């Protein structure tokens, strides 16, 4: 297209106009933090398990910021499940539940941040990443009462996997790593199935075709991934295995790589 | 299904298009006079859209290459400015602009203190806007609908610079082709390709809505249409959301 | 002595136990209906405690080794969440959650705008919590009392999941030993070793209190007990603070 | 004067008392950030022009923070003009217009900040200046409803030139550079006059005597400059010329130097 | 000229001198009783000045060499503290202190909720205070006037510890020379050299004012003078601003 | 105890239960900022005295952050005494007085911070301490209306000595130094007694037995000190003696050491 045609369309058409949408799609693509990696530290899968899970990951974070710029987001976990149960039983809508879950992810960010404070790493970005090479943040999206509900039920569909993914995408980060409590994706939930098979690499479409739309990641994240401009694959790893985060940051193919296409 | 409760069942939500505000006093002063007369009749949350200044900030930001999560808050700012302007015109009636956190958590007390408040119609998606388009998808119509439906409000009325929805842009290149639509469903609109006076994302949030059954788009440039719409009179385009009544 | 003035002498303060909220709709819905009926009778500051989720965050934080000043705000957050839940159920009556700075500096205007507001019962001690115990001492009962006495409120009523204070935990291992106490003094309670349904720090702040002469602990699981307590009827355990009347 | 006489006057007289005013004038003069330079990046003149103008200046900022401490303020531009037109047509007062203009300068600061984020430079000071040698800020003063109106009309008289200047003055910075879209001051507006002559150096009094009180800078800034204790001259340069900001920071006399006296 | 609209034409603004507050209960308690009686008669924005504590922070800051933009917020803080004190005394009437951003953007809703609010009279110039003098020029009188005129308020009354403006400081070394001025213009005052009980910058903002035609300075140490001044009775010094009436 | 027994108790008992309290006491003890030192700069004793007192301490702070991590808290002083007198005379309660005093400590933090800004030191922690090795903060606790009153009167019992001490304790800092205007503790107030004797080292219990419960430190701080887990002694030094803060940071026993036991 052309800058003049885009500006003409932007003034004279609705933003819904397909011709304007197509001209905007031709715009240049700036990555804000291209050398950073976003990592999600799971709530139920890691932080809720306490020292045995968190302390080794603290050690890995401290070791990694030496050669890797990190944005470290927290999940929510069992306390958010409790709040969702109370509020859902009262008939409260997804937008109210969203704010409740955010508070739990914030508690987890505070706990992790306090263990990293002596290493210079704050809870929050540009200045911190330039100096101490890492920050900690709460993973819940800020949608609050404006959370889009799911098709069924009042549980917010965009929780901390989505929040972390969207930050990686909108900052143009080079990599997104989800740190959970299983080695990766399996053909069935490994906690409730005896003979589930490990999947090292899969596309979103293949996951859907295998019935795995809502397995180790919030299924809305898989659709966000297919729409993403910058982060076109993600890696899921087991944070309970010593060194697994370090190895993933070093390029080792631990865990499962899920690709947009 | 066991649909959620209505938090503020007595609330009427009115979204004012940013392009209406862009017309300046010639459009704003009649609208302010109409709103003044509505304050004793309804409990109002008045939400403003963004308009042409957001098109300018998109022109600059897209030229700088910025992603859709950067453009979202930049547009939302223009809707906030429209809200501050409109609230100032109603200050002598006790109306003020209220910020998003206050809308989300303290609206009930504010509407106990006064008959109406003004806020920004954009939702606070910020840098967590969804990718796909380089234009932020969750804009003023979508934000206003999400809020009205979350609250279980009695209605949402969208105040436009046109009579409603046509089969083509009535100000565009196919303008002689454009036929007025008195009524439509969101699902029918979503299956059409072509421009609309409402966000495409509005149609998506209508599909997951739990309370609001219909939204009317009316021409704010015609005095009396907002008042009629708030009484349920059919003076623009009715959009059926697909929420089924009792 | 020349005791300080009463800032809000007409205020009634009600603290709702976090463990009451933890029972979900079965307990909350009757309490909400009772509160609705009380709004026209009293000017209410409704403060929520924390409950079981704070026990979980203590389990994690203690396992991580965190100090008591870290655990204090983590627990306070759960009381805030309970407050947001309860306020949402009362929104249609004009009730909203108000944040701690607003409670501290703007409560009078908020209670002029509406009949009740909800806030967190925990005090904002944050990382300045006192050392000694690994469990934060200044919790929801203590915060609610400090606020009620600072304001010179007409009363503080504590809404519990039990009938009041017993001589042993009525749900604990010595439960057949537990005898109900209709009335006690804070000084007598403070000299007992053993668990209570109220913070031990509550007894300490009662000893330095300047206005509140008695606090009643009542069972919120029994409809009507809160209403009776707010009229001074003896339906639970009365705690005498040692403030002497005129 | 003397400290004891000053304290006596401060207790016993009105602050309006000329004797107290004169004693306070004898106080010592601390410069808070004496080694920093304040630069204003114009809204209409630079940021509104997009990539062709902004990207070269980003490059210069990144190069300069190596040897120069920078406070980088943004102007507002065409979107603020639009807001002022809407609000003025409604009869709204200058104090209301002031807040509207601030939002536009904030948008510009966010856009510039995102292009500098990967270089460590935040949008906001002491810590940032110590570590990454630069910060970005919105240039509008914080006066809001308490903006003093002009003698005529409702356009706020203290806009982003004034905001940036006042920060340079109150931090005691060594230099104030306004980055615009013309080479400097001319004897007439160079965009609307054929034979305007360039002025390399001029005093405020000379500008007023030549009819130039309101030319390339907000005319209220010229009076602030004459009252200033720390920043007694300013430099105006063309940000559209490659390297012009770098050269001005190096001491080259590009553009126009306007002196208080 | 086409002067701007009046945002809050029904508002009365009252500025209380910090030196009045400095007298403590002996002055504050009668003033609080007078304000209580005025709440049903007027819609009041009550703004407090700074007083002697700002002189102390100027003594320290000037000794440390700090610039005028550093001293401005340090003085404003003392005016805020005076405001919190005064509001606390009126809390039982529904009055609270409101912060500057709230005054600027939400005053209308706050004065719908309650009959009066208190705020700081200093303007939020902060480190953007003007250079020239080492003493911040835009102080409490100036801030209160800027706000009252921006809102188009019905009046501004300045409550002083003296009867009004004299031809010399009536507490100063030329005190036998000092003659009371019942009426003056701002332009006449601005051409005098010598001290005044009001900021010199007040005279400058009066010259660019768009609505307020007169400001009365009255002695707050004399019960009844504020009440009379708010009814337009001449009980102190009237300052004509030079805004011409219709 | 054991983790399983603690979690059982935490779910099944009141937090007041002595068995739960004892199990929580057995938890591990993490120090958040173990290598940092907290210093209180007195309000009445130092900052209220102006340049002659403050400037030498600024110099010492700048010299010390080279080898010492510092959290620098401010006292309040004469302006807070004035506010307390006004408010107490009106019958306002301790909780109202607490907020008034906080504003004065904030003013002092701003003044000190502006003198340190050019050295990179901000007014506020983890990032600042990692990079510039110091931060400035206001010393008043955040209790506001929830301040516990004293047994008698309305003066807040927890003021800036308590605020600074509690931060040192809850961050697990290695050292707490109170900078006042006397060489240390004496057997009587040295300003109102002719022959007071200097005390180099004393325990809290010994202070109480000698009638010194409320002498150079807020007496509530002495009880906090006896309850502390991490900071079990404090040092009180004269900030008016050149180099005294530097020497205390170097381990010299200037002043008085007050021990919990
Ligand atoms: N096919 C599958 N393969 C692997 N794991 C699966 C599968 N299906 C379900 N899971 C489950 O998904 C879980 C991880 O999701 P979970 O929500 O616990 O992660 P989290 O990031 O810790 O969440 P939060 O942060 O919201 O607490 C695993 O514990 C596993 O039991
Ligand atoms: N099918 C259609 N029917 C009606 N109007 C249409 C249609 N397609 C495009 N339009 C155009 O949409 C315009 C309204 O623009 P738009 O919806 O962007 O403004 P707005 O709603 O005021 O702005 P904002 O979304 O910022 O509040 C109409 O003036 C019309 O030209
Ligand atoms: N002496 C006692 N008398 C009555 N109840 C007791 C006693 N000792 C322990 N308890 C227990 O305290 C329980 C109430 O728990 P708790 O006080 O922690 O909850 P809460 O007040 O709802 O919580 P929060 O303090 O977070 O608001 C009762 O159910 C009872 O089992
Ligand atoms: N005598 C003169 N010499 C040079 N430029 C002049 C003169 N008179 C007027 N100008 C104009 O001043 C303009 C610069 O002012 P302008 O307000 O555009 O700058 P800006 O800092 O980009 O503003 P903002 O940041 O508020 O958008 C130039 O574009 C030029 O056209
Ligand atoms: N010409 C004058 N007429 C009257 N009073 C004067 C004059 N010149 C000086 N003063 C002095 O001004 C005093 C009032 O002091 P000032 O105006 O500083 O206090 P304030 O207005 O209470 O303080 P703030 O401005 O902080 O609110 C009077 O008591 C009087 O001594
Ligand atoms: N026995 C004692 N030994 C030493 N000093 C004592 C003793 N008793 C009282 N003091 C007094 O305590 C004072 C220090 O307390 P003060 O409250 O002034 O300190 P501060 O930290 O500057 O306070 P703030 O920061 O709250 O202004 C000394 O100036 C001294 O006069
Ligand atoms: Mg539209
Ligand atoms: Mg209890
Ligand atoms: Mg005065």
Q: Assess whether the C-beta atom of E236 lies below 6 angstroms from ligand 5.
A: no
D82 backbone dihedrals φ, ψ, rounded to 5°: -65, -50
CA–CA separation, D247 and B232 (whole Å): 66
**CB-based contact, E11 to chain B, within 8 Å:** no
Question: Do the beta carbons of residue D75 and residue D43 sit within 8 Å?
Answer: yes
Distances (CA, A) of C93 to C115, F57, F99: 9, 57, 32
> Looking at the DSSP assignment, which residues form a beta bridge with residue F69?
F36
Interhelix angle for A160-170 vs B68-89, to 10°? 100
> Looking at the DSSP assignment, which residues form a beta bridge with residue E214?
E240
Kindly list the partner chains of chain F, i.e. chains with 3 or more CB atom pairs below 8 Å. A, C, D, E
Cβ of D143 within 8 Å of Cβ of E125? The answer is yes
Question: Least CB-CB distance to C112: which of E87, E98, E114?
Answer: E114
| Chains C and F touching, counted as 3 or more CB pairs less than 8 Å apart | yes
The closest of B230, B196, B221, B174 to B42, measured between CA atoms, is B230
CA of residue E51 to ligand 5 center, whole Å? 9
DSSP D48: G
Q: In what order do the strands lie in the sheet with C183-185?
A: C116-120, C43-48, C11-16, C155-160, C214-219, C237-240, C183-185
Residue list, CB under 5 A from ion ligand 9: E 17, 197
**CB-based contact, C92 to chain B, within 8 Å:** yes
**CB-based contact, B77 to chain D, within 8 Å:** yes
DSSP E91: G
Nearest CA in chain E to F47: E60
DSSP B97: B
Kindly list the partner chains of chain E, i.e. chains with 3 or more CB atom pairs below 8 Å. B, C, D, F
The closest of D78, D79, D256 to D178, measured between CA atoms, is D256
Q: Assess whether the C-beta atom of B20 lies below 6 angstroms from ligand 2.
A: yes
Count Cβ atoms below 10 Å from residue C193 Cβ, excluding itself: 5
Residues in chain E: 246
Question: Do the beta carbons of residue E187 and residue E242 sit within 8 Å?
Answer: yes
What residues contact residue A199 under an 8 Å CB cut-off, 6+ apart? A184, A185, A186, A187, A256
Structure-block tokens of residue A56: 């080794």
Least distant ligand from the CA of E21:
5
Alpha helices in chain F (DSSP H): 3-12, 18-25, 51-64, 78-89, 94-116, 126-131, 160-170, 204-209, 219-227, 244-249
Q: Assess whether the C-beta atom of B140 lies below 6 angstroms from ligand 2.
A: yes
Q: Are strands C237-240 and C183-185 parallel, antiparallel or unpaired?
A: parallel
Experiment type: X-ray
Q: Chain E closest CA to D175's CA: distance in Å?
A: 16
Structure-block tokens of residue E35: 């304000």
- Chain-centroid distance of CA A90 in Å reads 29
Task: Transcribe B189-205 into DSSP letters.
Answer: HHT--S--SS-HHHHHH
Q: Assess whether the C-beta atom of A43 lies below 6 angstroms from ligand 1.
A: yes
CA–CA separation, F145 and F10 (whole Å): 30
Output the CA torsion sign for D3, D8, D13, D14.
positive
Residues B96-122 as b or e (16 or more Cβ within 10 Å = b): bbbbbebbbbbbbbbbbbbbbbbbbbb
Alpha helices in chain E (DSSP H): 18-22, 25-38, 52-63, 68-89, 100-113, 140-151, 186-190, 200-207, 225-230
Test the B interface: residue of E106, E114, E211 with most B CBs within 10 Å: E106
Structure-block tokens of residue F250: 């170097």
Structure's resolution in angstroms: 1.4
CA–CA separation, C141 and C123 (whole Å): 9
State which H helix or E strand residue D103 sits in: helix D94-116
The closest of C67, C99, C63 to C83, measured between CA atoms, is C99
Question: Least CB-CB distance to D33: which of F118, F128, F131?
Answer: F118
CA of residue C198 to ligand 3 center, whole Å? 6
Residues D205-214 as b or e (16 or more Cβ within 10 Å = b): eebeeeebee
- Chain-centroid distance of CA D193 in Å reads 26
Which ligand 5 atom is at minimum distance from the Cα of E50?
26
Question: Do the beta carbons of residue B85 and residue D90 sit within 8 Å?
Answer: yes
CA of residue D13 to ligand 9 center, whole Å? 11
Question: Do the beta carbons of residue F75 and residue F45 sit within 8 Å?
Answer: yes
CA of residue E45 to ligand 5 center, whole Å? 21
Distances (CA, A) of F180 to E59, F43, F236, F240: 20, 8, 7, 8
Question: Least CB-CB distance to E96: which of C5, C6, C109?
Answer: C109
DSSP F147: P
Q: Chain B closest CA to C36's CA: distance in Å?
A: 14
DSSP D119: G
Structure-block tokens of residue D101: 């203009």
CA contacts within 13 A on the Cβ side of F92 = 33
Structure-block tokens of residue F154: 């309305």
CA–CA separation, E117 and B46 (whole Å): 25
Structure-block tokens of residue E214: 């007169």
Question: Do the beta carbons of residue A187 and residue A210 sit within 8 Å?
Answer: yes
Domain that holds residue E193: 1-246
The closest of F147, D154, A2 to B59, measured between CA atoms, is A2
Residues E197-223 as b or e (16 or more Cβ within 10 Å = b): bbbbbbbbbbebbbbbebbbbbbbbee
Structural domain tally of chain B?
1
CA–CA separation, E59 and E54 (whole Å): 8
Cβ of B199 within 8 Å of Cβ of A15? The answer is yes
Nearest CA in chain C to E84: C105
DSSP B6: P
């Amino acid at each position: 297209n052309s800058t003049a045609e885009l500006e003409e369309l932007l003034m004279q058409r609705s933003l819904t106009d397909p011709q304007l949408q197509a001209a905007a799609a031709a715009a240049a693509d700036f990555r804000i933090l291209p050398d950073a990696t976003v990592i999600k530290i799971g709530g139920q899968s890691v932080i809720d398990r306490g020292r045995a899970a968190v302390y080794p990951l603290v050690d890995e974070i401290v070791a990694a910021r030496k050669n890797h710029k990190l944005l470290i987001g927290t999940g929510a976990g069992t306390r958010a499940r409790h709040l969702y149960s109370i509020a859902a039983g009262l008939g409260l809508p997804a937008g109210v539940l969203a704010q409740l879950g955010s508070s739990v992810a914030d508690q987890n960010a505070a706990m992790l941040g306090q263990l990293l404070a002596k290493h210079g790493i704050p809870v929050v970005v540009p200045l911190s990443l330039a100096e101490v090479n890492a920050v900690v943040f709460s993973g819940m999206p800020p949608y609050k009462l404006w959370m889009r509900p799911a098709a069924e039920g009042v549980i917010p569909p965009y929780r901390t996997d989505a929040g972390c993914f969207l930050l990686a995408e909108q900052f143009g980060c080079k990599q997104m790593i989800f740190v959970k409590d299983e080695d990766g994706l399996y053909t069935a939930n490994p906690k409730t199935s005896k003979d589930a098979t490990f999947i090292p690499r899969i596309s979103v479409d293949e996951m859907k075709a295998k019935g795995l739309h809502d397995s180790i990641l919030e299924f809305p994240v898989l659709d966000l991934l297919q729409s993403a401009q910058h982060v076109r694959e993600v890696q899921v790893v087991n944070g309970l295995v010593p060194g697994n985060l370090t190895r993933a940051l070093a390029g080792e193919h631990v865990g499962t790589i899920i690709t947009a296409s | 299904g066991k649909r959620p409760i209505r938090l503020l069942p007595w609330l009427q939500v009115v979204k004012i298009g940013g392009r209406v505000m862009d017309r300046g006093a010639d459009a704003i002063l009649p609208l302010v006079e109409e709103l003044r007369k509505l304050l004793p009749e309804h409990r109002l949350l008045i939400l403003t859209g963004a308009g042409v200044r957001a098109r300018h900030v998109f022109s600059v930001g897209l030229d700088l290459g910025l992603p859709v999560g950067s453009l979202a808050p930049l547009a939302a700012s223009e809707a906030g400015q429209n809200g501050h302007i409109l609230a100032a015109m109603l200050a002598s009636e006790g109306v003020s602009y209220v910020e998003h956190p206050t809308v989300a958590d303290q609206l009930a007390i504010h509407l106990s203190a006064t008959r109406a408040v003004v806020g920004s119609a954009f939702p606070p998606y910020h840098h967590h806007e969804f990718p796909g388009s380089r234009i932020p998808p969750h804009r003023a119509d979508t934000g206003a609908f999400l809020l009205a439906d979350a609250f279980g409000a009695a209605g949402l009325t969208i105040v436009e610079n046109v009579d409603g929805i046509y089969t083509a842009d009535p100000n565009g290149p196919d303008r002689g082709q454009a036929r007025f639509l008195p009524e439509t469903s969101a699902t029918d609109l979503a299956k059409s390709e072509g421009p609309l006076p409402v966000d495409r994302a509005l149609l998506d949030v209508m599909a997951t809505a739990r309370h609001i059954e219909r939204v009317q788009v009316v021409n704010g440039l015609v005095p009396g249409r907002l008042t009629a719409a708030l009484r349920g009179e059919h003076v623009g385009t009715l959009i059926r959301t697909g929420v089924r009544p009792a």
